[PDB]
Amino acid sequence: SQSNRELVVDFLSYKLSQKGYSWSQFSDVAAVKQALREAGDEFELRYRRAFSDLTSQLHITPGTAYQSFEQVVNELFRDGVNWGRIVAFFSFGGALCVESVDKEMQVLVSRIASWMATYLNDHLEPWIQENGGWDTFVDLYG
């Protein structure tokens, strides 16, 4: 679970950095990490338009951010989990974090990181462990 938290922070930090934002400034607080970064890059490049849809259709504000996050993720996983959906999940949180900084709501960065790590640990971990853990992910997506 601490390794999962660290995976979430690695991904979010990477995605922020690609946009010129540092983790140390904007959060108030290894083979798997690399595979997830690459899968995230590939997913976002391949479906760029989906992420502009996200930032155009959903105007995040600190007061509605949690409810909106939970509604998206619950619908994403409504009928099950797979590796592709997990990648979409990480990319979604990455986009939310960058959007938050652009919009001067950077207090949400550490919150989104916490919501993702909670969801990952409580709801995604059971499936991930049942399917060969993250090393399997490295096999397919690394």
Binding site: Q71, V72, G84, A88, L140
Partner: peptide, 21 residues
């Protein structure tokens, strides 16, 4: 979100279908 989740889900599934063992 519903529509945003649907977009992400469908793309996650296409990604999954390609890479699944």
């Amino acid at each position: 979100x519903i529509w945003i989740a649907q977009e992400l889900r469908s793309r996650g599934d296409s990604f999954n279908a390609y890479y699944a063992r």
